[PDB]
Write a protein that holds these residues in place. Structure first.
Motif, PDB file in Angstrom:
ATOM      1  N   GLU A 231     -25.610 -10.595 -36.713  1.00  0.00           N
ATOM      2  CA  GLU A 231     -24.170 -10.470 -36.546  1.00  0.00           C
ATOM      3  C   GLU A 231     -23.790  -9.129 -35.942  1.00  0.00           C
ATOM      4  O   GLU A 231     -22.807  -9.050 -35.205  1.00  0.00           O
ATOM      5  N   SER A 232     -24.550  -8.070 -36.225  1.00  0.00           N
ATOM      6  CA  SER A 232     -24.258  -6.781 -35.603  1.00  0.00           C
ATOM      7  C   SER A 232     -24.403  -6.851 -34.085  1.00  0.00           C
ATOM      8  O   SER A 232     -23.532  -6.378 -33.340  1.00  0.00           O
ATOM      9  N   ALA A 233     -25.500  -7.439 -33.606  1.00  0.00           N
ATOM     10  CA  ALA A 233     -25.715  -7.559 -32.167  1.00  0.00           C
ATOM     11  C   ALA A 233     -24.649  -8.433 -31.524  1.00  0.00           C
ATOM     12  O   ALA A 233     -24.112  -8.105 -30.453  1.00  0.00           O
ATOM     13  N   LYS A 234     -24.326  -9.557 -32.168  1.00  0.00           N
ATOM     14  CA  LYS A 234     -23.299 -10.432 -31.616  1.00  0.00           C
ATOM     15  C   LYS A 234     -21.948  -9.729 -31.568  1.00  0.00           C
ATOM     16  O   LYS A 234     -21.192  -9.887 -30.603  1.00  0.00           O
ATOM     17  N   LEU A 235     -21.630  -8.941 -32.597  1.00  0.00           N
ATOM     18  CA  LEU A 235     -20.370  -8.210 -32.619  1.00  0.00           C
ATOM     19  C   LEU A 235     -20.296  -7.196 -31.489  1.00  0.00           C
ATOM     20  O   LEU A 235     -19.256  -7.058 -30.838  1.00  0.00           O
ATOM     21  N   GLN A 236     -21.387  -6.465 -31.249  1.00  0.00           N
ATOM     22  CA  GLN A 236     -21.391  -5.502 -30.151  1.00  0.00           C
ATOM     23  C   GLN A 236     -21.144  -6.191 -28.814  1.00  0.00           C
ATOM     24  O   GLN A 236     -20.290  -5.761 -28.021  1.00  0.00           O
ATOM     25  N   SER A 237     -21.877  -7.278 -28.555  1.00  0.00           N
ATOM     26  CA  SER A 237     -21.718  -7.963 -27.277  1.00  0.00           C
ATOM     27  C   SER A 237     -20.307  -8.516 -27.114  1.00  0.00           C
ATOM     28  O   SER A 237     -19.722  -8.431 -26.030  1.00  0.00           O
ATOM     29  N   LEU A 238     -19.736  -9.072 -28.184  1.00  0.00           N
ATOM     30  CA  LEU A 238     -18.401  -9.652 -28.084  1.00  0.00           C
ATOM     31  C   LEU A 238     -17.332  -8.585 -27.895  1.00  0.00           C
ATOM     32  O   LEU A 238     -16.357  -8.805 -27.169  1.00  0.00           O
ATOM     33  N   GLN A 239     -17.479  -7.428 -28.540  1.00  0.00           N
ATOM     34  CA  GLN A 239     -16.519  -6.351 -28.316  1.00  0.00           C
ATOM     35  C   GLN A 239     -16.552  -5.879 -26.869  1.00  0.00           C
ATOM     36  O   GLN A 239     -15.499  -5.673 -26.247  1.00  0.00           O
ATOM     37  N   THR A 240     -17.755  -5.718 -26.308  1.00  0.00           N
ATOM     38  CA  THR A 240     -17.844  -5.342 -24.898  1.00  0.00           C
ATOM     39  C   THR A 240     -17.216  -6.402 -24.001  1.00  0.00           C
ATOM     40  O   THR A 240     -16.495  -6.077 -23.050  1.00  0.00           O
ATOM     41  N   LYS A 241     -17.469  -7.678 -24.294  1.00  0.00           N
ATOM     42  CA  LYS A 241     -16.918  -8.742 -23.465  1.00  0.00           C
ATOM     43  C   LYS A 241     -15.398  -8.796 -23.544  1.00  0.00           C
ATOM     44  O   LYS A 241     -14.743  -9.087 -22.543  1.00  0.00           O
ATOM     45  N   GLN A 242     -14.821  -8.530 -24.715  1.00  0.00           N
ATOM     46  CA  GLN A 242     -13.364  -8.497 -24.824  1.00  0.00           C
ATOM     47  C   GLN A 242     -12.771  -7.330 -24.044  1.00  0.00           C
ATOM     48  O   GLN A 242     -11.731  -7.477 -23.381  1.00  0.00           O
ATOM     49  N   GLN A 243     -13.408  -6.159 -24.120  1.00  0.00           N
ATOM     50  CA  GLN A 243     -12.939  -5.028 -23.324  1.00  0.00           C
ATOM     51  C   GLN A 243     -12.991  -5.347 -21.839  1.00  0.00           C
ATOM     52  O   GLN A 243     -12.101  -4.948 -21.081  1.00  0.00           O
ATOM     53  N   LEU A 244     -14.030  -6.054 -21.400  1.00  0.00           N
ATOM     54  CA  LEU A 244     -14.108  -6.443 -19.995  1.00  0.00           C
ATOM     55  C   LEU A 244     -13.063  -7.498 -19.645  1.00  0.00           C
ATOM     56  O   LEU A 244     -12.538  -7.511 -18.528  1.00  0.00           O
ATOM     57  N   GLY A 245     -12.759  -8.399 -20.579  1.00  0.00           N
ATOM     58  CA  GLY A 245     -11.768  -9.427 -20.314  1.00  0.00           C
ATOM     59  C   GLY A 245     -10.368  -8.884 -20.145  1.00  0.00           C
ATOM     60  O   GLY A 245      -9.604  -9.375 -19.308  1.00  0.00           O
ATOM     61  N   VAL A 246     -10.005  -7.868 -20.928  1.00  0.00           N
ATOM     62  CA  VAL A 246      -8.694  -7.250 -20.747  1.00  0.00           C
ATOM     63  C   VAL A 246      -8.581  -6.620 -19.362  1.00  0.00           C
ATOM     64  O   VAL A 246      -7.563  -6.769 -18.674  1.00  0.00           O
ATOM     65  N   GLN A 247      -9.627  -5.919 -18.926  1.00  0.00           N
ATOM     66  CA  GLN A 247      -9.635  -5.333 -17.591  1.00  0.00           C
ATOM     67  C   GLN A 247      -9.585  -6.398 -16.501  1.00  0.00           C
ATOM     68  O   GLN A 247      -8.923  -6.202 -15.478  1.00  0.00           O
ATOM     69  N   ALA A 248     -10.282  -7.518 -16.693  1.00  0.00           N
ATOM     70  CA  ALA A 248     -10.236  -8.592 -15.707  1.00  0.00           C
ATOM     71  C   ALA A 248      -8.841  -9.191 -15.603  1.00  0.00           C
ATOM     72  O   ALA A 248      -8.369  -9.501 -14.502  1.00  0.00           O
ATOM     73  N   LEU A 249      -8.165  -9.372 -16.738  1.00  0.00           N
ATOM     74  CA  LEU A 249      -6.786  -9.851 -16.701  1.00  0.00           C
ATOM     75  C   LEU A 249      -5.883  -8.855 -15.988  1.00  0.00           C
ATOM     76  O   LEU A 249      -5.002  -9.246 -15.211  1.00  0.00           O
ATOM     77  N   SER A 250      -6.089  -7.561 -16.236  1.00  0.00           N
ATOM     78  CA  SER A 250      -5.316  -6.544 -15.530  1.00  0.00           C
ATOM     79  C   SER A 250      -5.543  -6.606 -14.026  1.00  0.00           C
ATOM     80  O   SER A 250      -4.598  -6.444 -13.250  1.00  0.00           O
TER      81      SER A 250
END
Lengths: 53, 53
Positions: free
Chosen positions: A21-40
């Motif tokens: 779950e730690s690894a999955k959480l890290q990857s998902l947090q990075t992906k969400q940060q990238l998704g906000v930038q992509a929407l921008s």
């Protein structure tokens, strides 16, 4: 002894593995940060029309 | 004489051998001391999860 066995069995049924779950959480947090930038990036489209008029 | 024989017989029935009990006591005391340490070792598991988060 029997009660210990039953408790261990239920724990084996419903418990999680936090190491994964730690690894999955890290990857998902990075992906969400990238998704906000992509929407921008996607929002700023069609702003170049005004220069034509 | 008969009473002495009967007392000796009952003693032969229910008496213990303390020379063997001394050795058994030593081994069991050592094993209990080792068991407490083993339980202490077993408790400290899962403490390394916190470093992942």
């Amino acid at each position: 002894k029997l009660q210990d066995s039953l408790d261990a069995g239920v724990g084996n049924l419903v418990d999680a593995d936090l190491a994964k779950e730690s690894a999955k959480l890290q990857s998902l947090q990075t992906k969400q940060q990238l998704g906000v930038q992509a929407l921008s990036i996607a929002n700023q489209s069609s702003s170049s029309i005004l220069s034509l008029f």
